[PDB]
Amino acid sequence: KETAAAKFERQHMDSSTSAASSSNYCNQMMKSRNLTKDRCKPVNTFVHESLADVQAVCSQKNVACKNGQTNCYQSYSTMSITDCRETGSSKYPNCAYKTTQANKHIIVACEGNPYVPVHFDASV
Numbered sequence: 001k002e003t004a005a006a007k008f009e010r011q012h013m014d015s016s017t018s019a020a021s022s023s024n025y026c027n028q029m030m031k032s033r034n035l036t037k038d039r040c041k042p043v044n045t046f047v048h049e050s051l052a053d054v055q056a057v058c059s060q061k062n063v064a065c066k067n068g069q070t071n072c073y074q075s076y077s078t079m080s081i082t083d084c085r086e087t088g089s090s091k092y093p094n095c096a097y098k099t100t101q102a103n104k105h106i107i108v109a110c111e112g113n114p115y116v117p118v119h120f121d122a123s124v
């Protein structure tokens, strides 16, 4: 029973490194954030910025979300991110991920009081 904000933190924050440094980053991180317990989660983005910087996006550029909701926000600046996406060789329980490191703007959906990120919509 995890709050939406806490789930976003676990799935999407990696403030301890500046960037992925190896092809095995996603395999490691998907496992240790408990994203491969029951199934291999197919796609998951990690953000290599402070939690404060990611939370601050909720006051930045208001944009539509993919699903048409209007509580999404696009970061004014690019951020260091890693996209983790399952390869064709991936088969639970032996999940396998491609690591793609990039510097891009993030789009998050925000909710609550405090008004914080609860969904990762996209990177641009």
Ligand SMILES: Nc1ccn([C@@H]2O[C@H](CO)[C@@H](OP(=O)(O)O)[C@H]2O)c(=O)n1
Pocket (backbone or CB within 6 Å): 001, 002, 033, 034, 035, 036, 037
């Ligand atoms: N893959 C994961 C890992 C944790 N969690 C949530 O985070 C909680 C653990 O802090 C989980 O509670 P359960 O252990 O009751 O499933 C679950 O609510 C999740 O929903 N999916």
Ligand SMILES: Nc1ccn([C@@H]2O[C@H](CO)[C@@H](OP(=O)(O)O)[C@H]2O)c(=O)n1
Pocket (backbone or CB within 6 Å): 008, 011, 043, 044, 045, 118, 119, 120, 121, 122, 123
């Ligand atoms: N670019 C993307 C697209 C999807 N996703 C993940 O895949 C899920 C469903 O598409 C998303 O749910 P949340 O936005 O609730 O975190 C997110 O965890 C991602 O992390 N990065």
Ligand SMILES: [Cl-]
Pocket (backbone or CB within 6 Å): 015, 016, 049, 050, 051
């Ligand atoms: Cl930090």
Ligand SMILES: [Cl-]
Pocket (backbone or CB within 6 Å): 050, 051, 052, 053
């Ligand atoms: Cl912080």
Ligand SMILES: [Cl-]
Pocket (backbone or CB within 6 Å): 055, 056, 057, 058, 059
């Ligand atoms: Cl804010």
Ligand SMILES: [Cl-]
Pocket (backbone or CB within 6 Å): 062
């Ligand atoms: Cl505007």
Ligand SMILES: [Cl-]
Pocket (backbone or CB within 6 Å): 074, 075, 076, 077, 105
């Ligand atoms: Cl922009």
Ligand code: NA
Pocket (backbone or CB within 6 Å): 031, 032, 033, 034
């Ligand atoms: Na773990």
Ligand code: NA
Pocket (backbone or CB within 6 Å): 015, 049, 050, 051, 052
């Ligand atoms: Na931080």
